[PDB]
Amino acid sequence: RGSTSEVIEDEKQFYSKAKTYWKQIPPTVDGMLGGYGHISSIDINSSRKFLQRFLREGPNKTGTSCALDCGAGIGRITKRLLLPLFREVDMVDITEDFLVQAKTYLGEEGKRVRNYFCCGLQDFTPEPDSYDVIWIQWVIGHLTDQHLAEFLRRCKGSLRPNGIIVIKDNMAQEGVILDDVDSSVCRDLDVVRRIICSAGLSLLAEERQENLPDEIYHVYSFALR
């Protein structure tokens, strides 16, 4: 199957099951990564290099005023990727326990987190003309094909001039695969690009994550606006 439509047979339960799952996950980095905390630094290093291209090299360079971290969890990415590069950061996540723990986890630099939005991305509207970078990592699998497209379109309206959206997530080898543990889907490259491009966003960059463990799904980063 090549669409959520076919592999997701109950959309209501697709969302409620995932909400239930994350509600009882420990608010820790090992929880944010399903036992793969040992690749967090490898992940962040590649994300930093991927993003520095847009922040440094002009002439339409991306600003450093504010970033949005979507599906931020306890702030693993906000802490080590976004806060060092952006003056202020907003976080949005559906799990209250993760936003509460993020206050402690982020430490003193967490004071530059402006808003802790508690909302599913399918119901969330980022404020217009607010963000230089919108970072969406390991959460697009929790949205249906349609909701993802519509969320990306709402993100487009919240970008400042020269801003970009970044998606970083697992890719399936073929088709759309449902994970019955956490109630998420994994889509192949063709499906993701189609959802992006057919939603009215331009693909600016695309990069496969190297040096990952052999046993895990491939991971891709996309830059779009």
Binding site: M32, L33, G34, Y36, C186, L212
Partner: peptide, 4 residues
């Protein structure tokens, strides 16, 4: 996050 990452999956097998």
């Amino acid at each position: 996050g990452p999956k097998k």
